[PDB]
Symmetry: none
Subunit: 140 residues, 2 copies
Amino acid sequence: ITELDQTAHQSDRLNNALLMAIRSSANVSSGFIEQLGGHDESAGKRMALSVELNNKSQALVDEFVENAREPALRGLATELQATFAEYAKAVAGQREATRQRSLEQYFKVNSDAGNAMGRLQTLRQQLVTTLSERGQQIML
Amino acid sequence: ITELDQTAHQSDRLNNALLMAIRSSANVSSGFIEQLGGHDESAGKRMALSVELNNKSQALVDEFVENAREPALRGLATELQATFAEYAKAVAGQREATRQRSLEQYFKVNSDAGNAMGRLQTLRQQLVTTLSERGQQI
């Protein structure tokens, strides 16, 4: 029954990582809105929240890769880690666009992140399916 | 295996509902900045996506809560229903502010929204853990 809890924790890492990665990009936009409204300190707070959420998401993504040992899982896990690196740099580019106070630059790397996020969602769906297949197999 | 397939469907309803709810508010803040930059066509598209995502995730949460009859679940399922009702109330306020293009209105509910998503995340974990235990209770 130890192997089942291990699969469930891989599932939680995956679902938590994606949720916090989306939150992180959302907080960048909220920070940019605060700055355009004259609240530079609250913009600073939202920037810190975005980096925090992104760093936690990255920690969970790497934990998932490290604890992935089933061969049907590791090929996708590598893809998830590479694709998340893409998403992180785009969110970093969003925080940098906030720094420039450049709006048209913000829209460019915002589309970047949404593009990479769309591929993270497809990868998450494959891994959840691989994970829960493995869990159901242990039970049968 | 039918009782196991329903705890599987229940976890899928919950995980999808959260992902779409977080995406719904992210589209509103992205839409709001797009209005500030003059990208009004794009912002209108983000608002339509946010309303559709809110509608589907509300439908998934509703179905999840109504099917959560188990005693270890009912309390947490009620907490999710309450928490999600207060999240949709804040994201709807973010959308109202963006349509009115009011920075003042946006700043009233933007913290309400973001805070509740963290709690949604917390409750998802507590619920999936309880569902995973009932699933292996077989």
